[PDB]
Paper text:
Ubiquitin-specific proteases (USPs)5 are key players in the regulation of important cellular signaling pathways through catalyzing the deconjugation reaction of ubiquitin from substrate proteins. The multifunctional protease USP15 regulates several important pathways in health and disease, including TGF-β, IGF-I, innate immune signaling, mRNA processing, and mitophagy. USP15, USP4, and USP11 share the same overall domain structure, including an N-terminal domain present in USPs (DUSP) and ubiquitin-like (UBL) domain followed by a protease domain that harbors a ∼300-amino acid insertion predicted to contain a second UBL domain. The USP15 catalytic core displays the characteristic USP protease domain fold, including a finger, palm, and thumb region.
This USP15–mitoxantrone complex structure revealed predominantly hydrophobic interactions between mitoxantrone and USP15 residues Tyr855, Gly856, Gly860, His862, which are located in the BL2 region. In addition, one of mitoxantrone's side arms contacts the CC loop Asn264, although the density is weaker compared with the mitoxantrone anthracenedione core. This binding site coincides with the S1′ region of USP15, suggesting a rationale for the inhibition observed. In this position, mitoxantrone is expected to compete with substrate interactions, as indicated by modeling a diubiquitin molecule into the binding site based on a superposition with a USP30 C77A Lys6-linked diubiquitin structure, the closest available USP structure in complex with a substrate.
Numbering used by the authors: 254 to 343, 353 to 440, 755 to 810, 817 to 913
The structure:
Amino acid sequence: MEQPGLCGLSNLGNTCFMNSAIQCLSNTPPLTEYFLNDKYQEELNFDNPLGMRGEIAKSYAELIKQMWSGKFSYVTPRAFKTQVGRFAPQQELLAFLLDGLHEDLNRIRKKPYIQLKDADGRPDKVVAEEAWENHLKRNDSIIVDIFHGLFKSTLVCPECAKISVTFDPFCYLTLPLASKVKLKDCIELFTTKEKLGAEDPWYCPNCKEHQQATKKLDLWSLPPVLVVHLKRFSDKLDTLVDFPINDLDMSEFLINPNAGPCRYNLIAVSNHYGGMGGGHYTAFAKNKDDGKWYYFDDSSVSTASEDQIVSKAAYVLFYQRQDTFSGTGFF
Ligand SMILES: O=C1c2c(O)ccc(O)c2C(=O)c2c(NCCNCCO)ccc(NCCNCCO)c21
Ligand SMILES: [Zn+2]
């Protein structure tokens, strides 16, 4: 075709999930814009021991420039997949993709060792800000800017009443599934206090001993692009998760009381059809130039209506924060 971004991807074999993942990333406007304006050359990290000397970021840039040139109805991501395979010899490809891009473009030249401190008695605000600052001392890139948020973990040990509060970064949110359910039900279930199994207990440093310490997670800060992975694999759970296309307001789940509005509009959806033993991934994506929705099935690109987006096939959701929309301003 002749419109940039309406470009499919040939199936190199099975390459599970990679094409739909690339389409989700391709239709993440700030990421694609960063690559198309050649802002990535300045930031290529050539001797990061955790990176590919820039080869992942370079191959992704070439692929994205091809997809948004308007010259192709579909291309092959063969060089990109080759580099990704060298970075990750082998599931959730997305974490490895985001990590490969991040390290290839990390502004930190040499990561310093940071001694972990527990929250002690300090306020959540102080400890969260400390953790975010420490993270940026080790990880600072366009991938952090777009995708990273901060979550809280509270572990309470019944043996010695010890409470361990830690704040940790994330680049996507894996949600448990609660029969039809709403997305907010999955978020709510994500933040509920749980009892760790005997198969997965906590090593209490005060006790030098593992056992059933309660664990509860909380969202501290949410990124410009919130990636929400619905945990359908542990047989495959096909529950219809009803999620909004527009105006997802996350503020009720944020425990940072000085946080911003965090309202989101959906931009992409990774679908899976079948089960693990037999399955295929596709994607819905909103095109950044005309605002319409499209369906990407490898090389095939076609028009879509919002009627088709919310289905039980929905597997990963890409949301963009309304205050980060390019060329748009809220009051
Ligand atoms: O491609 C779909 C599919 C679709 O494009 C649109 C709607 C759908 O419902 C499907 C779909 O269900 C599907 C598969 N479903 C499970 C049947 N086999 C499972 C038992 O082994 C199992 C496999 C499957 N993919 C076959 C096409 N892929 C060829 C390249 O790998 C699909
Ligand atoms: Zn203990």
